[PDB]
Amino acid sequence: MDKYHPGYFGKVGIRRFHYRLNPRFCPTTSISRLLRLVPKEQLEACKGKEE
Amino acid sequence: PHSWGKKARTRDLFSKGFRCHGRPSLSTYLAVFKIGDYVDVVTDPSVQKGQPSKVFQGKTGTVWNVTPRAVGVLVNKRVRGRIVRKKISVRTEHVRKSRCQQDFKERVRHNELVKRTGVGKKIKRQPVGPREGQLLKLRKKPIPLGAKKFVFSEVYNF
Amino acid sequence: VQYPKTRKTFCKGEPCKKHQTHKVVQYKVGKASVVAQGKRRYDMKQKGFGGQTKPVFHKKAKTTKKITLKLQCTSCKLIKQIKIKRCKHFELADRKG
Amino acid sequence: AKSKNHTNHNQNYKDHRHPIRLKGRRNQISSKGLEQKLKKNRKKSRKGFLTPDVQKEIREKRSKKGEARRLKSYEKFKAKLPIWKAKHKAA
Amino acid sequence: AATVNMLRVVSPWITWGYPSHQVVRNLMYKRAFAHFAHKRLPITNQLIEKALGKYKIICMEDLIYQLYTCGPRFREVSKFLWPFKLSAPRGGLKSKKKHFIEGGDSGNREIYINQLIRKMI
Amino acid sequence: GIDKPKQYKNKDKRHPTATNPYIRVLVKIYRFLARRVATPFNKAVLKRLMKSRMWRPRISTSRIKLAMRKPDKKDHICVCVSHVIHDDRVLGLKPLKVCALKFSKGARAAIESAGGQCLTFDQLAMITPKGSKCVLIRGKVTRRKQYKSFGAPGVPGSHAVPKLGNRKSALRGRRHENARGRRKSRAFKVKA
Amino acid sequence: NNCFRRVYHSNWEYLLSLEKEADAEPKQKALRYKQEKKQQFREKGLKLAAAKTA
RNA sequence: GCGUACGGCCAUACUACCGGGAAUACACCUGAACCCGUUCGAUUUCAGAAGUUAAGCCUGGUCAGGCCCAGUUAGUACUGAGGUGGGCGACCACUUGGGAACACUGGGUGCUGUACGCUU
RNA sequence: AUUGCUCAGGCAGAACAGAAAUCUCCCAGGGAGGAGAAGGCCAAAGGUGCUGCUGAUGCUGCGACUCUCAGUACGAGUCCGAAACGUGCAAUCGUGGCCUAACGAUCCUUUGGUCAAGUGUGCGAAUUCUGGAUAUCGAAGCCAGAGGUGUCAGAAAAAUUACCACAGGGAUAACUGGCUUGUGGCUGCCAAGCGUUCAAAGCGACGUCGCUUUUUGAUCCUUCGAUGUCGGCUCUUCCUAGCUUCCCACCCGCAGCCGAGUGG
RNA sequence: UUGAACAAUGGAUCCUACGUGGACCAUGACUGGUAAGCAGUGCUGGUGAUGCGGGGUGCUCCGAGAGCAGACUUACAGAUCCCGAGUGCUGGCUCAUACUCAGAUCCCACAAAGGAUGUUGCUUACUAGUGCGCAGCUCCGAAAAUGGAUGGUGCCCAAGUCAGUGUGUCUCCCUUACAGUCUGCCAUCGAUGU
RNA sequence: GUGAAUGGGUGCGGACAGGCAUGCUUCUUUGCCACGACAGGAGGCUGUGUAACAGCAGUUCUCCCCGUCUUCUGAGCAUGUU
RNA sequence: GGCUAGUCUCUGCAUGGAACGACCGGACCCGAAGUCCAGUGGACAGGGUUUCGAGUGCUUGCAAGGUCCUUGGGACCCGAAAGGUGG
Ligand SMILES: [Zn+2]
């Protein structure tokens, strides 16, 4: 147990009664995966322009 | 031996020499160690601080770390079927500059000065081999070698 | 074993951050609160049938406690809590004796 | 009941089945443990490192420094050379 | 020095001696195989040229010459050679267990290893 | 009897473990090439076609772009003995020749939207039989969720991901295996 | 010998000679620079010999 | 041929006894207003230069004690490997290698670096 | 930590004062001291007096290591970085004891810190109790200690069974047998003495070499899916370390008798 | 002189399923014990896991290591016969009236102190003789219980014992292991061309 | 007070060795200016080949000296060259 | 790509080791200077560390099958003396 599962055998942290997870659900993306989500017709007609 | 202390079975080991007691001299402190240097880890019992373990008593390591009063040394230690690179932090009273590479460095400097200046003959250090035939005039006359008579008195002198 | 009544030591408190006078007091264990979470759990487990539930201690090998000392900084009134070794008797040094 | 506990009998054999080697001998050793002043100084040195092109032109300038003296003296010696060769002929 | 201090310590398992020119020749021409290409090949002049041409050695006479009179390339020749397999000798051994000086058949037979090789080829 | 040295067993792999007959056809082609052209590239491709599937790992158009980013590789063909999948993070690709065992729909579209070509290994064998101007790239076998767990977490220095079967705690403070041997508060913490 | 006294004396002579090495190391560095100059000259002379014989 | 200061190695340098010491010194040496320290200006601190090599220091001697060196002990003791060697054993011899120690004999009794001087 | 000094013991000397009080001089490599067991270490000192101090937890959720070792922890210890300090002219030395022993997991509790408050002579600088807030109410959390597991990698713990049972064990006792024979039993060698004189007719002290299994040990090799465990009776056979008979043996401190010893 | 020798199909990087975790034997390296086929250790090798030749027999000794066959040769060790191989060759020594027949290859299957005018040699003191001794064999010391064991027979200028010798050469130096050499086949692991 | 035999650690080079020039640093140093300014003379010199050193080639040459200007601390890590 | 049976440069995958003047989150220390506003004074920001993470540094994923295994299950098969519930 010491060698293959260190953190076994203990108790740590604030315990949260009635842990709601729907108000904590928050999938994250990144800026690297934004311009894939724009039809590149817009990405082209908006390149240097103001829109 | 039913006591494995840090200094167990070190009566003869950590004893100073006959008429060699006293703390180390200034030649021990004026030595200079650089990283990569080879050093004999040799415990000095007159200084009870920074001592290495008795298991690195005649081990030659290489310097990896230089602290103000001590030096870090990497010594190989056979555990059972491995070798581990033990790191010791040992003061410089318990370590000596190792001459284990002295002959090699002498030979290398010799060969390089040879090939730089054009004098010398570039040691290659073969073993001591068989000899050639000689004719050996040798005035000296041979002494009769042979067994001698047994004398109980001359054997059991009293 | 004696220990001074005061001791100049480093107070790691925002006002001081340096060596202060640090009056010395022994550490007395406080009354166990009956409303601590573990005590409440132990009570909820003890009540009912089944007898004793947690293991009591009987062996009692030690004859000495480690001595704990609260040094209170005379300026911050911040308490540094140090420990010394296993000693049978202990008293703050009345330095005349 | 009563056992024969300790023995070091087959241990060299088991230990020598495969060669007794150090795992990482050519590998570098971590910088953790190295003295803090030396680690900070390595960091700051590398920060201050110039680039290879700047270094090349620096070395070029250093070589060009003593050139007017060197080329002049060398050409003077090279001029005096054939007299030396013709004197060495007469030997 | 290096080889003799090993021969000493393994002497209870080996004999050794100083072979004659014709014994060397018989060994080479009747028992010699090449340790080449991780195989055990019968020596031929072409195999000798391939494995040792680098050293101006082209024929079996070169091998015999270096072996008998060491020459510069004894090391390369001997490495090229595969350890000779010899039959159990005719006549036989006096006694494996003693030394040659003790009447046995171990240690150094300085010249009486020709008598042994001759029985073993 | 003889005090033997170790009898030679060739470490290298010389039979495709792949069950795809067309991977076997490619192994046949590149056996032919590694024999009767005998270039280091052909021998490498033969090795990699032998490789099992763990060892010809997927590779991304981002790795293709990183390989060919240098101006030296204007006409080179990026060769991956692997499935090629698209890095959505990569937006602007250059015209690239890329040979592989399979191109995902996304990777194929991203490479053919930049004017590049998606080559199979037979096309590569007919274009560059010696594999000249071919940039071999492999794909990374670390970063696997198995490789991360290899070793022991309770060994100091080994930062192995503990094996958690199906138990993904929601409270990351009250996680599984995080207390005794994971904080010096609990009498010790596994060393780094 | 192998005495502690003999070994300590050999170490003290070693340290003496390392000190003298460091003491004459600047002069040695000058000499070695000139030696590398002569090695450069020798190499280039060999190169010229080869290029003229070819 | 030496002196002083700082040393390195730390007795071939120490210990005892008997002698000698040119110069520079070093040293002993003279006093207590101050700095300073003491039970006591003994040590120590300060301030000096009348005297002396008496001692310290240097140096010469000793079949001195010690220390060091060489020989010798001694191929003795011991010992790795080997034997279907011996022996009831105890243990010993042999083959192939390695190889001391005390004692005894005799000889010796610091070398030297940096700086400043003396001797000129 | 600075600094001064030199210890055990001894010669010699000084009123009471002596073996031993205190004082003085010389000698003294440590024969003292350093808390304790032993070992190592140490002399203008890892000793000791005086004095000054508190570095006896080097700010942290703070490092690399070493012994142990699975190269895990605890523990112990070495080496560093830099805050703040002690001492010192300073270099330095100092984060306990000159060094090798002197000690302790989860969970729980407790205290300190965090927080909160306070300061803030203007700003900040923040853990939680989930429908949103408040409350030096309470509770939880994280961090550092402490309360102990000595069976000391850490269950909470009395006996009896001849009324007994089960799974096993010849890993393991009690009976035979095996090895050894200390003990027991039986013989040897030497010769101080006894024997009226005379070491042996007969003994044989002090010493010492053996033998047997034949007592008791010692062991634990076979047997615990059982080899029926003492003695006696019955019946056979064998050994000789010979009691009787035989050689009417040889020898005597053998006249006879009765005997002693030795041999087959 | 690419700056010691020899060897080396190898170095690096990993993953992973098991069995084992009663050991025992041998050796002046030993410790406890009077000792033990006792108990505990050290180095190495063996047994376990291992058959084969020899030791009569024997898990551990000596030789050697094991695919199926053919030929040759040997190891240890052997040749009176049992039992393959000389009642070999050349010098000695020993004769033992028992119930231990004298003695008869390691382990190992025991022997001691002491004694002998048996015998063979040698040293040595005395002036051929007399003393001390010292080695080889032999004899006594030498006693257990079913009848029995150099393995049996038996052996006696041995078939005991100590040496030498069998030489690419020998009137007689030969025997043979699953070992060495050569060959064929089987299988394995490889190399090369495909 | 000595001290074996047997042992144990380390080292024995590239064709990565060895040498040379330069850079950076908040680390170290009194050791910076300076990656700066100035600078003379002597020379059958240097290398390959040789015990006859003849011969052959000339490369920012050899020496005073890696000079002087108060005279230029190391360490670690790099950039080049051989 | 030059070049040459001397042999130079550029590319640098995978893997292993080291590093980071990098960055994300946590923990320290000196600070909180500076910029800014969806303005209850709040949001970040700077420089340093012997710092930690199952961190990132061009996402190494999912599903099915198969092999050897693990743990719960009768759990390779057989095997207690026992304990309990109801008769
Ligand atoms: Zn305070």
Side-chain angles (χ1 to χ4, degrees):
Chain A
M1 202 71 82
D2 285 15
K3 188 164 171 168
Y4 303 99
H5 310 286
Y8 215 79
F9 294 142
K11 193 208 303 174
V12 171
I14 276 162
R15 68 201 205 271
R16 286 267 152 94
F17 308 142
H18 197 49
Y19 203 53
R20 284 102 47 90
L21 285 160
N22 288 7
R24 292 184 31 89
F25 187 76
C26 175
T28 58
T29 190
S30 312
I31 287 172
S32 63
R33 285 171 64 80
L34 285 173
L35 312 183
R36 71 180 179 92
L37 299 166
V38 177
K40 196 203 181 203
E41 54 95 14
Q42 286 169 334
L43 217 59
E44 279 214 59
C46 299
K47 174 59 175 63
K49 278 71 53 185
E50 178 188 0
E51 258 165 359
Chain B
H2 62 83
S3 77
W4 300 265
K6 288 185 200 50
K7 285 183 175 168
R9 277 88 53 191
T10 56
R11 179 178 196 167
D12 287 312
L13 185 59
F14 289 152
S15 295
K16 305 294 288 287
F18 181 65
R19 298 205 273 127
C20 306
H21 302 92
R23 299 188 63 145
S25 301
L26 263 296
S27 66
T28 318
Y29 293 122
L30 293 167
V32 168
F33 309 85
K34 295 188 192 174
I35 308 195
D37 276 31
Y38 279 90
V39 284
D40 304 327
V41 181
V42 179
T43 297
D44 194 310
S46 306
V47 178
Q48 276 99 43
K49 206 182 285 222
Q51 281 197 0
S53 193
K54 58 188 205 305
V55 304
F56 321 105
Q57 176 46 43
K59 310 258 161 290
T60 301
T62 186
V63 164
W64 72 280
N65 197 40
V66 190
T67 68
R69 283 317 202 264
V71 70
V73 292
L74 300 164
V75 304
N76 305 333
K77 199 195 187 204
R78 184 209 164 173
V79 169
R80 263 199 61 236
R82 300 171 295 157
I83 278 186
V84 305
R85 184 172 270 167
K86 295 296 195 188
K87 289 185 169 188
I88 325 165
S89 297
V90 56
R91 285 181 147 256
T92 64
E93 297 88 2
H94 327 273
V95 75
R96 319 214 206 98
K97 301 195 68 63
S98 178
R99 293 192 294 127
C100 67
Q101 271 193 334
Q102 178 172 68
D103 68 285
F104 172 50
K105 293 332 181 78
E106 293 292 329
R107 180 173 73 242
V108 160
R109 272 173 286 187
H110 193 248
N111 299 349
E112 298 315 307
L113 188 147
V114 168
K115 64 162 51 171
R116 275 184 300 177
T117 43
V119 293
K121 188 63 177 67
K122 266 160 78 56
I123 315 301
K124 188 178 175 66
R125 200 188 54 157
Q126 294 104 14
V128 56
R131 317 208 170 192
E132 314 91 342
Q134 274 282 59
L135 213 53
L136 192 61
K137 302 268 187 65
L138 196 147
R139 286 173 184 171
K140 180 173 311 196
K141 53 194 60 194
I143 310 176
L145 172 85
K148 322 181 70 71
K149 183 158 306 177
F150 168 80
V151 180
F152 181 65
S153 177
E154 307 196 25
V155 175
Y156 291 67
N157 319 122
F158 288 125
Chain C
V1 170
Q2 296 171 32
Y3 206 96
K5 309 265 203 53
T6 81
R7 163 188 176 194
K8 297 286 288 295
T9 186
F10 179 80
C11 179
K12 48 172 281 201
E14 313 178 301
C16 301
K17 287 304 193 177
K18 67 168 180 311
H19 267 71
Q20 302 290 122
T21 300
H22 282 268
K23 200 180 303 171
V24 182
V25 188
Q26 201 160 358
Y27 158 75
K28 289 282 287 302
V29 184
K31 287 182 179 290
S33 159
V34 72
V35 77
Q37 164 63 95
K39 185 63 170 50
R40 298 188 253 119
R41 161 182 315 121
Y42 174 58
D43 291 16
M44 303 326 186
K45 192 180 197 199
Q46 277 299 103
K47 71 188 320 209
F49 292 107
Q52 178 79 8
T53 48
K54 304 294 290 294
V56 301
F57 194 32
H58 292 147
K59 287 310 195 43
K60 184 83 212 84
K62 296 297 177 300
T63 77
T64 289
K65 293 181 210 152
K66 287 146 152 188
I67 286 294
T68 302
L69 290 167
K70 310 174 183 164
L71 320 185
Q72 195 170 198
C73 174
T74 57
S75 57
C76 289
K77 274 72 181 166
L78 186 89
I79 288 176
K80 199 178 80 147
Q81 220 173 31
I82 67 169
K83 72 175 166 69
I84 66 190
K85 305 210 183 190
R86 284 253 155 80
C87 51
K88 301 209 168 95
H89 316 279
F90 170 85
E91 60 101 20
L92 299 165
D94 286 328
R95 60 165 52 256
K96 61 99 175 182
Chain D
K2 187 176 171 189
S3 61
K4 210 171 186 177
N5 305 320
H6 154 76
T7 310
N8 196 81
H9 180 262
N10 202 40
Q11 304 321 309
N12 266 319
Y13 187 59
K14 293 205 307 166
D15 292 3
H16 272 100
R17 299 294 256 139
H18 315 290
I20 300 188
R21 308 202 177 106
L22 181 62
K23 192 80 191 308
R25 322 174 287 269
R26 268 188 205 245
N27 300 150
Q28 314 210 22
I29 64 169
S30 299
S31 295
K32 289 189 71 183
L34 186 74
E35 190 181 5
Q36 298 88 347
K37 296 172 90 61
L38 196 42
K39 296 189 64 176
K40 293 156 182 41
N41 181 55
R42 285 189 182 169
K43 286 194 201 208
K44 291 160 170 162
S45 300
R46 278 170 197 146
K47 194 202 193 177
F49 276 4
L50 300 173
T51 76
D53 51 14
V54 186
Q55 275 182 121
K56 177 57 71 74
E57 66 180 1
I58 281 181
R59 270 179 277 108
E60 182 182 1
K61 175 192 164 172
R62 294 293 288 272
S63 65
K64 295 146 40 200
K65 293 303 294 182
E67 206 170 12
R69 158 73 52 85
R70 275 177 286 180
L71 295 184
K72 194 195 65 195
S73 178
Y74 168 81
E75 288 308 315
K76 178 179 175 176
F77 150 81
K78 172 172 181 50
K80 311 157 61 170
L81 175 147
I83 293 90
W84 288 0
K85 283 196 170 190
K87 164 156 73 159
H88 171 83
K89 280 189 192 68
Chain E
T3 301
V4 158
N5 282 105
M6 307 203 299
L7 290 180
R8 294 179 190 174
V9 305
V10 294
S11 66
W13 295 268
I14 63 172
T15 43
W16 71 93
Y18 323 136
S20 60
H21 172 51
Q22 198 61 30
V23 163
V24 172
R25 294 186 52 90
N26 288 330
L27 279 172
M28 289 312 294
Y29 275 114
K30 296 144 181 48
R31 286 301 190 188
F33 286 74
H35 170 47
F36 192 68
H38 306 290
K39 289 192 190 166
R40 190 186 176 248
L41 312 170
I43 277 181
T44 48
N45 286 126
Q46 310 319 303
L47 184 61
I48 297 185
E49 171 81 338
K50 181 179 285 284
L52 286 155
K54 186 72 168 291
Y55 312 105
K56 283 78 176 176
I57 278 162
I58 74 166
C59 54
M60 162 85 86
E61 302 303 307
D62 286 293
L63 310 195
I64 303 179
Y65 186 75
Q66 315 281 323
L67 290 159
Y68 185 58
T69 70
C70 276
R73 315 265 67 87
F74 174 89
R75 181 198 169 280
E76 286 78 17
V77 166
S78 63
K79 289 197 81 82
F80 162 80
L81 286 182
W82 188 286
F84 302 82
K85 294 165 151 194
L86 304 176
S87 79
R90 300 185 308 279
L93 312 163
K94 296 281 193 230
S95 68
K96 259 177 189 175
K97 304 162 139 171
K98 317 178 181 174
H99 191 269
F100 183 80
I101 298 166
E102 312 176 289
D105 308 290
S106 179
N108 194 355
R109 321 191 186 189
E110 68 257 13
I111 61 149
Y112 291 102
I113 210 168
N114 302 290
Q115 274 86 351
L116 186 57
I117 291 150
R118 282 159 195 171
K119 300 186 181 284
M120 293 199 170
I121 319 176
Chain F
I2 175 163
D3 179 350
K4 295 183 287 184
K6 167 189 306 190
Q7 190 185 18
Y8 183 63
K9 279 155 288 279
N10 200 326
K11 284 175 175 169
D12 310 333
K13 199 181 160 186
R14 288 177 174 183
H15 50 85
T17 49
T19 318
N20 192 358
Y22 301 91
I23 301 289
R24 298 207 299 252
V25 171
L26 295 183
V27 170
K28 196 170 171 324
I29 301 160
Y30 271 83
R31 265 163 193 164
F32 190 90
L33 293 186
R35 291 293 293 269
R36 274 171 83 172
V37 168
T39 53
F41 175 85
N42 288 115
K43 278 166 283 184
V45 176
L46 187 47
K47 262 179 281 186
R48 297 177 194 207
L49 294 163
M50 299 324 200
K51 296 291 148 279
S52 58
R53 189 175 183 176
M54 174 202 173
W55 290 108
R56 38 187 176 87
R58 322 168 310 133
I59 198 161
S60 48
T61 53
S62 64
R63 292 300 193 199
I64 319 298
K65 186 194 82 50
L66 266 191
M68 308 282 288
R69 80 179 185 291
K70 294 304 187 67
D72 298 332
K73 313 171 170 58
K74 55 96 181 176
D75 50 349
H76 292 41
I77 305 102
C78 183
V79 181
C80 319
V81 196
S82 295
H83 206 131
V84 171
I85 58 142
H86 178 38
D87 194 16
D88 263 16
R89 297 192 318 243
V90 166
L91 265 294
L93 259 185
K94 289 191 199 158
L96 292 174
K97 313 185 189 190
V98 185
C99 186
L101 286 183
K102 271 152 194 284
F103 289 82
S104 72
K105 297 185 312 294
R108 169 181 299 283
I111 297 160
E112 301 217 322
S113 174
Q117 264 197 26
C118 297
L119 304 179
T120 59
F121 273 102
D122 59 51
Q123 299 179 320
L124 175 75
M126 280 175 289
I127 285 171
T128 69
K130 321 166 65 64
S132 278
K133 300 178 185 170
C134 297
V135 189
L136 264 177
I137 65 174
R138 294 195 222 245
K140 175 177 306 299
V141 192
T142 64
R143 297 311 323 259
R144 283 172 82 243
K145 61 158 155 55
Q146 282 93 339
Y147 169 90
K148 298 178 181 172
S149 296
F150 288 169
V155 163
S158 177
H159 297 264
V161 162
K163 297 217 200 165
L164 301 174
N166 48 356
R167 321 183 64 175
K168 311 166 43 193
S169 295
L171 266 167
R172 204 196 165 270
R174 308 185 54 89
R175 222 204 297 105
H176 300 92
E177 287 90 2
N178 84 326
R180 186 249 181 199
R182 286 295 202 209
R183 328 169 68 76
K184 291 183 299 296
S185 166
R186 273 70 197 169
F188 91 96
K189 182 205 188 308
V190 171
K191 200 72 65 58
Chain G
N1 308 317
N2 271 335
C3 298
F4 170 73
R5 163 157 175 245
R6 211 279 316 158
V7 174
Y8 184 71
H9 191 64
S10 55
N11 190 33
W12 174 69
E13 307 185 74
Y14 186 43
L15 297 191
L16 276 166
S17 297
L18 283 157
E19 175 187 357
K20 303 167 196 166
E21 180 166 19
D23 263 8
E25 203 73 3
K27 187 64 164 178
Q28 282 309 296
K29 268 184 281 185
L31 267 299
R32 264 176 283 128
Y33 164 82
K34 307 174 175 300
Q35 280 169 18
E36 260 311 314
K37 288 199 64 160
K38 277 199 179 187
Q39 164 59 231
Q40 285 215 49
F41 202 81
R42 165 188 298 117
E43 200 294 319
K44 207 180 181 314
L46 276 182
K47 189 192 190 307
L48 269 70
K52 68 93 178 178
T53 191

